Amino acid sequence: PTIRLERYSERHVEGLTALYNDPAVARQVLQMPYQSVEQRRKRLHDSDDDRLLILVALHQGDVIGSASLEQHPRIRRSHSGSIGMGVAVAWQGKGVGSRLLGELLDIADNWMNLRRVELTVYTDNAPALALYRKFGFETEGEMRDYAVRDGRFVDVYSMARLR
Amino acid sequence: TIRLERYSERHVEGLTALYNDPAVARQVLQMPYQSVEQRRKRLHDSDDDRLLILVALHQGDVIGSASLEQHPRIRRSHSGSIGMGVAVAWQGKGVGSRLLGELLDIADNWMNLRRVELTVYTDNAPALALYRKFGFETEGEMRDYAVRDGRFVDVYSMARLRR
């Protein structure tokens, strides 16, 4: 399986909207179902800062994953970046999460020269947790009733990777 | 003596002076030498019932400030954040408790928030004592979270739950 990584752009709006519109994908991050292609196309054209990088994983031209890294906008926090709820993959277990996470960390380390990369993950998302720890993330805190998922408040682990 | 009021244009000058005190600015994430200029552009065009900013006044002088912001995302909207917390000129004079107690009244009785979040520097004992007094519990410790006095310092990630 050949996986190209690309900067999320106009030509990807349709596939990415579809990726996060899958209830099984959305519930593991903070997205809501039924998002519009046009509302996302907007937020895209309403984006231009190089401190926010959004990558899409592709197969035969289809968006099968996505991840983002954003350096904090505040000067006293600018040595850190966040990848949010993490990697969003549709094809789990086929190396997409690793391809995306490795590429984002490469940028953080070697190009932005960030000292700290932060993320949050649902405490029961064992597969995601295993991936993040493989890449150097450690749990720093546990946040109770952090977000809504499946009609109830669930916890997330707050993680960080220091360089 | 201490009057609490909604932060508006009338206060931009006093609030700016507040943060220009390095002893105040260093315990939060603000930068010194801010100018009434950029703040006004921020306030006078930035209005949601989600963000509440208060200023503590004594004889018309801004001696303290704090803000509560309900998270914008639907799946996180049951929570709110007060950032690095309470920014006070007079430590020990009861300005912090005044401000915080009032933001929590709004959070509990009007917004009906289930979770309020904050971060505080690990070595700021009086602030930690204040947040603990109001029900906040430490949920995690974040290493090299921000810059303070030319070095990376840690913070405690705290949350106050209402169930």
Note whether B156 and B141 are within 8 A (CB). Answer: yes
Give domain limits for chain B. 1-163
Give the CA dihedral A118, A124, A127, A133, nearest 10 degrees.
Answer: 40
**Neighbouring-strand partners of residue B137:** B159
Residues of A in contact with B73 (CB under 8 A): 30
Contacts of B53 (CB under 8 A, 6+ apart): B6, B7, B65, B66, B67
Test A76 with B146 for CB contact under 8 angstroms: yes
Residues 67-106 of B with CB under 8 A from A: 73-76, 78-79
Question: Would the CA dihedral through A137, A68, A156, B154 be positive or negative?
Answer: positive
- The technique is X-ray
Both tokens assigned to A22:
């899958």
Residues from chain A contacting residue B159 (CB–CB below 8 Å) = 143-144
Q: What letter represents residue A5's amino acid? A: L
Across the interface, of B73, B139, B144, the residue whose CB is closest to A142 is: B139
∠ Cα A147 A150 A151 (to 5°): 75
3-state secondary structure of A18: helix
Cα(B96)–Cα(B105) distance, integer angstroms: 14
Rounded to a whole number of angstroms, the distance from the CA of A89 to the nearest CA of chain B is: 20
Q: How is residue A151 written in tokens? A: 């009609």
Chain A CB within 8 Å of residue B148 CB = yes
How many angstroms separate the CA atoms of B113 and A51, rounded?
32
Do β-strands A4-7 and B61-70 pair in parallel, antiparallel, or remain unpaired? unpaired
Distances (CA, A) of A123 to A85, B61, B98: 11, 46, 35
**Which of B141, B146, B147 is closest, CB to CB, to A141?**
B141
For residue A88, give the nearest of A143, A35, A48, A140 by alpha carbon: A35
Cα A6 to Cα A11, A40, A59, A100, B158, distances in angstroms: 11, 17, 11, 10, 37
Amino acid identity for residue A136 in this structure = G
CB contact under 8 A, A160 and B142: yes
**Residue A147 CB partners (closer than 8 Å, separation 6+):** A30, A122, A153, A154, A156, B75, B76
Name the one residue in this structure whose structure tokens are 């009434």.
Answer: B36
Which CATH number among 3.40.630.10, 3.40.630.30, 3.40.190.10, 2.40.37.10 corresponds to the domain A1-163? 3.40.630.30
Phi then psi for A150, rounded to 5 degrees?
A: 55, 45
B29 near A CB under 8 A: yes
